[PDB]
Amino acid sequence: GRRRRLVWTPSQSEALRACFERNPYPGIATRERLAQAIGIPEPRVQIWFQNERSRQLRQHRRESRPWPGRRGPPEGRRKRTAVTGSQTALLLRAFEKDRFPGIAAREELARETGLPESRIQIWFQNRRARHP
Amino acid sequence: GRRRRLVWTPSQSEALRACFERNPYPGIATRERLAQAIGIPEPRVQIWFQNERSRQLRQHRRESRPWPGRRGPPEGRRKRTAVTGSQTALLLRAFEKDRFPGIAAREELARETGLPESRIQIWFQNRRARHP
DNA sequence: GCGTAATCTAATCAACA
DNA sequence: TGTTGATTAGCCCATTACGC
DNA sequence: GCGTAATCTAATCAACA
DNA sequence: TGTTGATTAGCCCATTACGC
Numbered sequence: 001g002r003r004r005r006l007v008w009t010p011s012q013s014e015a016l017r018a019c020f021e022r023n024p025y026p027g028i029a030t031r032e033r034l035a036q037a038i039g040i041p042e043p044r045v046q047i048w049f050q051n052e053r054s055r056q057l058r059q060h061r062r063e064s065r066p067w068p069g070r071r072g073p074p075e076g077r078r079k080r081t082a083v084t085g086s087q088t089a090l091l092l093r094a095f096e097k098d099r100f101p102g103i104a105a106r107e108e109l110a111r112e113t114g115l116p117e118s119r120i121q122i123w124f125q126n127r128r129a130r131h132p
Numbered sequence: 133g134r135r136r137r138l139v140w141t142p143s144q145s146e147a148l149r150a151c152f153e154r155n156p157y158p159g160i161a162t163r164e165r166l167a168q169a170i171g172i173p174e175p176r177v178q179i180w181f182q183n184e185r186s187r188q189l190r191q192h193r194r195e196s197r198p199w200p201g202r203r204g205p206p207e208g209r210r211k212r213t214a215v216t217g218s219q220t221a222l223l224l225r226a227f228e229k230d231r232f233p234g235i236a237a238r239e240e241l242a243r244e245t246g247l248p249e250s251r252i253q254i255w256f257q258n259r260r261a262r263h264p
Numbered sequence: 265g266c267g268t269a270a271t272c273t274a275a276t277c278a279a280c281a
Numbered sequence: 282t283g284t285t286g287a288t289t290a291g292c293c294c295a296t297t298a299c300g301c
Numbered sequence: 302g303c304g305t306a307a308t309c310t311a312a313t314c315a316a317c318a
Numbered sequence: 319t320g321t322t323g324a325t326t327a328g329c330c331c332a333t334t335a336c337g338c
Contacts, residue, residue, distance in 0.1 A: 002271070003269085003270060055268085062292095080280070129275090134308070176306085178325090179308095189294090193330090235307095258323065268334105298307080313327105
């Protein structure tokens with residue numbers, strides 16, 4: 001069971017497109033600034049940019065048009081989430097049970113740990129990658 | 133269980149390519165003439181030409197080069213196989229049991245009917261298409 | 265069924281102990 | 282420096298499944 | 302796993318009753 | 319003319335699965 005996909009409003013989609021033309025590699029500050037402007041969580045904005053770039057990369061390559069890329073200084077990343085030893089212990093127990101937690105499983109770990117669900121999702125991605 | 137694919141010899145592949153450059157839409161006479169020259173049944177030759185054309189069509193389209201097509205008068209088709217009423221009755225019974233007979237099932241129908249297995253395969257193709 | 269948000273892997277950047 | 286959280290790309294014309 | 306023979310559908314040509 | 323045997327093409331850049 002994956003996350004119930006969300007439906008952008010017309011005005012939300014315009015703000016995403018506009019900010020994407022301004023800079024298609026926004027930092028955490030930009031994303032949070034946009035997230036708060038349009039009323040959806042920053043993790044959703046991050047995903048949209050990742051998908052939009054992938055959509056644009058696929059298109060520029062079909063048009064045989066070169067892809068501009070990272071224009072301007074790279075914006076600041078997210079702060080490296082600090083995860084305590086106990087928080088880790090819960091993820092390890094959740095991981096041996098199910099490597100692929102759904103949105104239901106992830107959202108409960110975010111209660112049992114206090115970690116943002118978005119970060120828990122990334123933790124499992126990295127874990128699955130580094131522990132076959 | 134599908135037919136055990138066959139492996140062309142180098143000299144067989146050259147004769148196929150050569151005849152394909154001569155005419156990529158050979159009639160039954162040409163195919164049988166080539167089949168007997170290289171030592172594999174005409175149904176195999178027919179399949180090869182059908183696949184080779186499909187391979188060539190996919191390539192010319194990637195190269196943006198136009199596909200020549202049927203050059204010269206169209207060569208004669210195969211004689212419309214005559215199928216008796218009893219032969220049909222066996223195919224209908226085999227069809228209600230299994231719409232997708234394998235090579236094992238088809239090769240036995242060719243004994244129980246006297247029809248070429250290649251024609252039995254075509255019969256099922258047409259039947260499945262016209263009787264959902 | 266289409267559009268695409270959600271998801272995934274493999275690699276690489278990069279903070280922190 | 283190792284570990285691990287963070288970010289990014291993802292590359293083309295029926296489909297299926299065997300022999301090599 | 303790659304190359305591709307084997308297979309498939311949907312449509313269309315075409316013989317025969 | 320209907321039925322059915324015969325022949326041909328097959329159309330593009332991570333994958334999955336939901337909301338519309």
